[PDB]
Design a protein around this ligand. Structure first.
Ligand SMILES: Cc1cnc(Nc2ccccc2)nc1-c1c[nH]c(C(=O)N[C@H](CO)c2ccccc2)c1
Ligand SMILES: Cc1cnc(Nc2ccccc2)nc1-c1c[nH]c(C(=O)N[C@H](CO)c2ccccc2)c1
Lengths: 359, 347
C-alpha cells in the first residue's frame, strides 16, 4: 500500500525495498510526478523526492502474477556507473482495476542519445566527435559489464541510452528485453528495434549470442557519425538490402554462421562498398575502422565490448590532458572492476592508462 | 528529351516493339531501384517505369509474376525492357506499368493531418477492391507478402484501387518453407513476427485487416518499433494468444512469457459511430489462427460491402462506381457459389 497526503502539494508515501543490499524497507516520499515516457505494459514518470528534492524516474509496469519480473531480477544484480540505478522497487495498484503493478524507482537522467542526436540532425549538424567517443566508450563499458554476467540487453538503441548533458555521463536503461543467454538454449528472434537489429535476428536465428548488442552499438555509432540511421527499412528484407549495400552480399559461410530459420540465397550478388566512402570526408579513420569491426556478418568476428573500449578510436579518452569542451573533467572511465575485465583481463593493459595507475 | 527502346509487351506474344517516351521524373524508390513517371510519345499516356538492378543468375521473379497477371485491381505491366543505369556495366530491368495518381498512404495521411476520417464509402470501395486483387492472386497460389498503404494505388476520380509492388510476391507451396522477414512494420501477421516459415497466403488477409482498421482509426492499429512491441499491441486487442493459437501460428520459438491479458471488445477499439459491419469484418480478418481468417473472396462477400452492391450507389463526385462485379471463373475458383452474393441481380 501507499499513502497520499498534501501549500497543497500532493505527496505519495510508499514503503519500498532497496534495489541493492539487504531487504530493509524504507519509507519513500515523492511529489511532482509527470509522465516522461511509455512502453509495453507501462509508463515512466519523473518524480521529486520530498526530502532531498532529488529527481528520480519511476517505471511502473503491469506485474504478472505467475512469476517474478525478469527486468527487476536483472536490475537487482546490476551496479555500474554506466547503467541506470535501481534505487528501490515497490508494488501498487494502477489503471487496470484488480491488477498489481511493479514500480521501479531509478535514477532520473535529463537527456537521451535519441533526443540529442535529433536536435543536431534537425539542425543539419553532427555531434562533435569527442562526444561520440565519450558516449560510445561508455556504452561499450555498460555492455562489457552486463555481458560479463552472460546478460544480453537485446534492445540497444538511442532511446534506451540516457545522458547527462553537463557531465557527459551515459547510462543504459530499459532492461525489459534483457536476458541471460545460455549456450544451447534457444531465444526469441523478435526482440530488438528497427534499424538496430543484427542480421542474424532479421534472418530468424534463435541461437544468437550477446554479440547482437555489439551490432546494435555499431549501428548507433554509425548513426551518430552519419546524422541518420545506417541501415533503415520498414521490413526485414529492406533492412538486409541496406546492409548488403554496405557490407556486400554475405557468403554462404556467413549465412551459416548467422544461421537463419530459413533463407533462399536469392539476394543479388553485390560487392562491398568501401567503409571510407560511407561517411563524410573528414570522418576520423579510427571511427571508420571501429564500425567495420562492429558491423560484421559473422557474429564471432565482431569485437567484444571490452575489445571495443580498447580500440584506438578511444585513444583520445586515455590522454591524461583530455577535458570536456566545456572545460570540465571527463567522467570516470578507467575504474574497471575484476568482474568488468573478466572476459579478457590482460586488456587492462590498454584500458587503464599509465596515468590512472599512479600512486 | 525522347527515349526510344525496343520493349516486350507485358502480356501475350513475345513480340517486341519500339516504344518512345518522354517527360521522365522520379516518383519513388525502393530496394535496388527507382520508379519514374513518363509520358508515352504516341498516346500522351502517363506510365510508371520501375527500374531495378538485374541479377543475371536468374529470371526476375517480379517480372515473371507480373507477366501472368491481368486484373482491374492490379497495376498493369504494359512492357518491359533492359537497359544500363547508375552502376556502370550493370544491367537493369525496366517495368513499364500503368501510372496511378495517388496511394492509400497519401490519401489516408491527408485525412489524418486534417483531423478528418476518410468517408466510409471510400473505405468500402478501397477495401473491397484490395480483397478482389488478393482473391485473384491467391487463386494462382501467389501471396503478395507486403500489403500496406504505400503499395495500394488509387485514382481519386474513378475511385479505382490498384495493387502494386510485386517485389516480395511469391507462390507459396504447402511443405515448402518461406522467409519470415518479408512484410512491413505495422502490417505483419503475428505468425511472421513469431518467425514461422510455414505461413500461408492468409498473411495478406491479416495485412488487409490492418489497413482497414487504420483507415477506420486514422492511425495504425498495431504500431511498435520491434516485434515484441507489435505483439504487445496485438495482445492488447485480441488478448493473449492461447497455447493452441501459438501452435497454429507455429513460431520458430517462443517463451510463453507474455502476461495473461483478456481480449478488448472490438467495438470499443473504434470511434462510437463506426459501422458495426466494419467492426465485424475486422474481427474476422485480424485473428490469431491463420485458418480462421476470412479468405479474400469471403471478405468481398461480407455485409460491410453490401452498399457497393446497391444499384443506386454513386461516388460523392456524382460518377458511377468503377467495375466491381466483372468476376472471372479464375477469380471465383476458391468458392464458386459466392458468385450468388458477389454478382448482384442488376449487374
Ligand atoms: C530510467 C529513466 C531515467 N531517465 C530518463 N530520462 C529521460 C527520458 C526521456 C527524455 C529525457 C529524459 N528516462 C528513463 C527511461 C527512459 N526509458 C525508460 C524505459 O525503460 N522505457 C521502456 C521503453 O523503452 C519502457 C517504459 C515503460 C514501460 C515499458 C518499457 C526509462
Ligand atoms: C507503379 C506505380 C504507378 N503509379 C504510382 N503512382 C504514385 C506514386 C507515388 C505517389 C503517388 C502516385 N506508383 C507506382 C509505384 C509505387 N510503388 C511502386 C513500387 O513498386 N515500389 C517498390 C517499393 O514498394 C520499389 C520501387 C523501386 C525498387 C524496388 C521496389 C510502384
Amino acid at each position: 500500500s501507499m499513502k497520499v497526503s498534501r501549500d497543497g502539494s500532493k505527496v505519495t508515501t510508499v514503503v519500498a525495498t532497496p534495489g541493492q543490499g539487504p531487504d530493509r524497507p524504507q519509507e519513500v516520499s515523492y511529489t511532482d510526478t509527470k509522465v516522461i515516457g511509455n512502453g509495453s505494459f507501462g509508463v515512466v514518470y519523473q518524480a521529486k523526492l520530498c526530502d532531498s528534492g532529488e529527481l528520480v524516474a519511476i517505471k511502473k509496469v503491469l506485474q504478472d502474477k505467475r512469476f517474478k519480473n525478469r527486468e527487476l531480477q536483472i536490475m537487482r544484480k546490476l551496479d555500474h556507473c554506466n547503467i541506470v540505478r535501481l534505487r528501490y522497487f515497490f508494488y501498487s495498484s494502477g489503471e487496470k482495476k484488480d491488477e498489481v503493478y511493479l514500480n521501479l524507482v531509478l535514477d532520473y537522467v535529463p537527456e537521451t542519445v535519441y533526443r540529442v542526436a535529433r536536435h543536431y540532425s534537425r539542425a543539419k549538424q553532427t555531434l562533435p566527435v569527442i562526444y561520440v567517443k565519450l558516449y560510445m566508450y561508455q556504452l561499450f563499458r555498460s555492455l562489457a559489464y552486463i555481458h560479463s554476467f552472460g546478460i544480453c540487453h537485446r534492445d540497444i538503441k538511442p532511446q534506451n541510452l540516457l545522458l547527462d548533458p553537463d557531465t557527459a555521463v551515459l547510462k543504459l536503461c530499459d532492461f525489459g528485453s534483457a536476458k541471460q543467454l545460455v549456450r544451447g538454449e534457444p531465444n526469441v528472434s523478435y526482440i530488438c528495434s528497427r534499424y538496430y537489429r543484427a542480421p542474424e535476428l532479421i534472418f530468424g536465428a534463435t541461437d544468437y549470442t550477446s554479440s547482437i548488442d555489439v551490432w546494435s552499438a555499431g549501428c548507433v555509432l554509425a548513426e551518430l557519425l552519419l546524422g541518420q540511421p545506417i541501415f533503415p527499412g520498414d521490413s526485414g528484407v529492406d533492412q538486409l538490402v541496406e546492409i548488403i549495400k554496405v557490407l556486400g552480399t554475405p557468403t554462404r559461410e556467413q549465412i551459416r554462421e548467422m544461421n537463419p530459420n530459413y533463407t533462399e540465397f536469392k539476394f543479388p550478388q553485390i560487392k562491398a562498398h568501401p567503409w571510407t566512402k560511407v561517411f563524410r570526408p573528414r570522418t576520423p579513420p579510427e571511427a571508420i575502422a571501429l564500425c567495420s569491426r562492429l558491423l560484421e556478418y559473422t557474429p564471432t568476428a565482431r569485437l567484444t565490448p571490452l575489445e571495443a573500449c580498447a580500440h584506438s578510436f578511444f585513444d583520445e579518452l586515455r590522454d591524461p590532458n583530455v577535458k570536456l569542451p566545456n572545460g570540465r573533467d571527463t567522467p570516470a572511465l578507467f575504474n574497471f572492476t575484476t568482474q568488468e575485465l573478466s572476459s579478457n583481463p590482460p586488456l587492462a593493459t590498454i584500458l587503464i592508462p599509465p596515468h590512472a595507475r599512479i600512486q
